[PDB]
Design a protein around this nucleic acid. Structure first.
Ligand code: MG
Ligand code: MG
Length: 807
RNA sequence: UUCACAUUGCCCAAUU
RNA sequence: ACAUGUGAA
């Protein structure tokens, strides 16, 4: 379970395409640089405050130490210099004042950039991490002070334009920046981005925006408890500033107006306090005060003397309208984004950055050219009379004149309509039934007759007794179609009951899609229905599959989904699916709740054991090979994850049978990186968005210098700029060639049963996502006693276990 | 809750 | 994910 396998070869399959990547070559000197350890007492202050401390510590202690040396700082404890500092080894206490801190500098090490060159070439097997870290600290030292750092990105108010969102928020533009080793050179990965920020405005104006006032004096009355509570929820936690210089965090909003609100000086009011001490009379005395600092003390500031501090990211969720405006502001086609990144890099002036130039680094201002190959799509085989073969074109095909490979005859089914009768009439339901049966017969999934049961219902409470009744009354019941009036808790209840309480197949459909049907929608609905009932929609043309299918092989997809920002004990959800036939088409699912924000799948061995057992029951084969697509592990966790999960896989094998030792291939799938690929030639641009065509593959130039990784953009780019999926092979007993693995991955992107399209990641990974999503629905408002309760929540019924209920 | 693609959390990141 | 867009037999 040690080091990732070396790249075995380069891919040769498919026609070439000229591409540009948002990677900008770096020239790094062949020079040793110097790494010093810093400790700033006390180390509780924000990273930025530390950065300032060091920043003018260097200014204040210029004479003795640095002497024209321009150090870079990571913001916490790491300092780097281009040539060695005068303090030969010895920790030195330094005294720094801020307009109070002791800073100790001690030598740590030498970082050789020559060793980095050696790693980029053949000579070193590994890329020296410390070196990359050093370069990264160098490159982001200045913009960490100039701009507002968010993660690996930087944001700023765009000078000359405003993009308000309302509610005191506006769009800030910026960019992601990262330093990456490559087959060719050190690369600077730069992408543009945008995010909502709080406006740097007076608090009075903030109040007006949040409470929807065109101006204050609507009214000159204290706010209603409603208004005050909304304002409270909006400003709580934000930083404000005064002029009397002072910055505070807002912990509350007083109930009383400033004229009435009092504190112990003897009881003294806030307004009067400002009159007496600060010679100020409140223009808006009827308004509340912000409570700032510790909520235990009693420090209360009037609204009209405070400003919202500049550069605070808006953490809180945006409204629907705010979001709409955000999208509208930041939407760019592929060529537009390409031009924006290029414009940004020409206007960046990285090479005049005094710290960059101090470390002798040069950055290229043009995107790297890279040659991709466009893989051929697999043929898709259908069934019926035709045995039709479909040929994807630009990552899309369709169901017209085709029947499912194996279509289910639906004989017994029901309809529960939770939409109101007056809006979703019996005529609507009838007409919808007619249409659905037409499309379904065309597809080889004949709904033989009318539903056996069709009643209206209201509220979540009616779900369980209705479903119990159905299961007890109609023998051979295959499906319940559930019509919903849009967003409702009923959906989650329908799933809790069907999936985990009764083990019944349900298909939900929104009221509006019953009222107005279209062939495309009903067709997609049929994809879902056929799968849920155990059917096989289509299969990869068998003779067109890579040689790996010549022996029994199981395809696993795995994902962990974590709770959103904020809520803190809500668990993470681990989901693993495995193929159950040779096509591969049918999948079974396993799911677990696990520790909050843990990425490592804790219970993997038990899950894989289950899947292996089910695979044997379905196919009567034991897999000689296990292909494991693992979604969403970042590089910094590669070793962590691979160590636990690979072993878990082995354990599942070992405990199942000895000496059962199938070859394992462990592939990390990453859809959330910042690598963008653009057509160099305009006539290669596909559709309105002008993206690279589906099947575009890149395994040279910008990829890893020694390891086995590649980009594959398997999908049609409909809108904006495509995200090409990245695949990183952490382990491979099966000794794949690049060609076979890339082609296999591509083909798996065509087995996804919910649409006749090639999807952005292989089917097993996608299914993993759907399973986790469904689990999250089983857990809504539910968050060993506790953990057992949550584990119970996501446990499907016995009859649901062997199904694709997640489709 | 027909579906994909894209933006986006979340892993890794980040003295009144 | 939700939310928001763009689309489809
Ligand atoms: Mg995940
Ligand atoms: Mg949506």
């Amino acid at each position: 379970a040690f080091k990732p396998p070396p790249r075995p070869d380069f891919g040769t399959s498919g026609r070439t395409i000229k591409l540009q990547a948002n990677f900008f070559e770096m020239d790094i000197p062949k020079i040793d640089i110097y790494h010093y350890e810093l400790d700033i007492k006390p180390e509780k202050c924000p990273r930025r405050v530390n950065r300032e401390i060091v920043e003018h510590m260097v200014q204040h202690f210029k004479t003795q130490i640095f002497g024209d040396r321009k150090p870079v700082f990571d913001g916490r404890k790491n300092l780097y210099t281009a040539m060695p500092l005068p303090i030969g080894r010895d920790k030195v206490e330094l005294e720094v004042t801020l307009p109070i801190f002791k800073v100790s500098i001690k030598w740590v090490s030498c970082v050789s950039l020559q060793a980095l060159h050696d790693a980029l070439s053949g000579r070193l097997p590994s890329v020296p991490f410390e070196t990359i870290q050093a370069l990264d600290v160098v490159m982001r030292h200045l913009p960490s002070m100039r701009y507002t750092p968010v993660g690996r990105s930087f944001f700023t108010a765009s000078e000359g334009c405003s993009n308000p969102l309302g509610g005191g928020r506006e769009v800030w533009f910026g960019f992601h920046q990262s330093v990456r080793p490559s087959l060719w050179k050190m690369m600077l990965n730069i992408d543009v981005s945008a995010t909502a920020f709080y406006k740097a405005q007076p608090v009075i104006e903030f109040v007006c925006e949040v409470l929807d006032f065109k101006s204050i004096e609507e009214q000159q009355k204290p706010l209603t408890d409603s208004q005050r509570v909304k304002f409270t929820k909006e400003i709580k936690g934000l930083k404000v500033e005064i002029t009397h210089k002072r910055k505070y965090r807002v912990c509350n909003v007083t109930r009383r107006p400033a004229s009435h609100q009092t504190f112990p000086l003897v009881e003294c009011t806030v307004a009067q306090y400002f009159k007496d001490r600060h010679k100020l009379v409140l223009r808006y005395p009827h308004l509340p005060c912000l409570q700032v600092g510790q909520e235990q003390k009693h420090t209360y500031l009037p609204l009209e003397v405070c400003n919202i501090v500049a550069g605070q990211r808006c953490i809180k969720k945006l409204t629907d309208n705010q979001t709409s405006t955000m999208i509208r502001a930041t939407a760019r086609s592929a060529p537009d984004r390409q031009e924006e990144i290029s414009k940004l890099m020409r206007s960046a002036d990285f090479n005049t950055d005094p710290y960059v130039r101090e470390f002798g680094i040069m950055v290229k201002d043009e995107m790297t050219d890279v040659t991709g190959r466009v893989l051929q799509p697999p043929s898709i085989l259908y069934g019926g009379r035709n045995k039709a073969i479909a040929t994807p074109v630009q990552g899309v095909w369709d169901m017209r004149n085709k029947q499912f490979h194996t279509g289910i005859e639906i004989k017994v089914w029901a309809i529960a309509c939770f939409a109101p009768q007056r809006q979703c009439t019996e005529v609507h339901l009838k007409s919808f039934t007619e249409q659905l049966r037409k499309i379904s017969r065309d597809a080889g999934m004949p709904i033989q007759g009318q539903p056996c049961f069709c009643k209206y219902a209201q509220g979540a409470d009616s779900v369980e007794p209705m479903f119990r009744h159905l299961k007890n009354t109609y023998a051979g019941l295959q499906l319940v179609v559930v019509i919903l009036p849009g967003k409702t808790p009923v959906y989650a209840e329908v799933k809790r009951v069907g999936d985990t309480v009764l083990g019944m197949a349900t298909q939900c459909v929104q009221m509006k899609n019953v009222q107005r049907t279209t062939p495309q929608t009903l067709s997609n609905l049929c994809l879902k229905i056929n799968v849920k009932l155990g059917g096989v929609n289509n299969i990869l043309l068998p003779q067109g599959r890579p040689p790996v299918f010549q022996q029994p092989v199981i395809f696993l997809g795995a994902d962990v989904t974590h709770p959103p920002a904020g809520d803190g004990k809500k668990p993470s959800i681990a989901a693993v699916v495995g193929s159950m036939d040779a096509h591969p088409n049918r999948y079974c699912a396993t799911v677990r709740v696990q520790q909050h924000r843990q990425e490592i799948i804790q219970d993997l061995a038990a899950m894989v054991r289950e899947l292996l057992i089910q695979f044997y029951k379905s196919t009567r084969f034991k897999p000689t090979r296990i292909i494991f697509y693992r979604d969403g592990v970042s590089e910094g966790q590669f070793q962590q994850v691979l160590h636990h999960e690979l072993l878990a896989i082995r354990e599942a094998c070992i405990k199942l049978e000895k000496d059962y030792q199938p070859g394992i291939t462990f592939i990390v799938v990453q859809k959330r990186h910042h690598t963008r690929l653009f057509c160099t030639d305009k006539n290669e641009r596909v559709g309105k968005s002008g993206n690279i065509p589906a099947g575009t593959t890149v395994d040279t130039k910008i990829t890893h210098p020694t390891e086995f990784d590649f980009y594959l953009c398997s999908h049609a780019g409909i809108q904006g700029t495509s995200r090409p999926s990245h695949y990183h092979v952490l382990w491979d007993d099966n000794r794949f060639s690049s060609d076979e693995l890339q082609i296999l991955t591509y083909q798996l992107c065509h087995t996804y049963v919910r649409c006749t399209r090639s999807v952005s990641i292989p089917a097993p990974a996608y299914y993993a996502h759907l399973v986790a999503f469904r689990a999250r629905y089983h857990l809504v408002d539910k968050e060993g006693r506790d953990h057992q309760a949550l584990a119970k929540a996501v446990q499907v019924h016995q009859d649901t276990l062997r199904t694709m209920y997640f489709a």
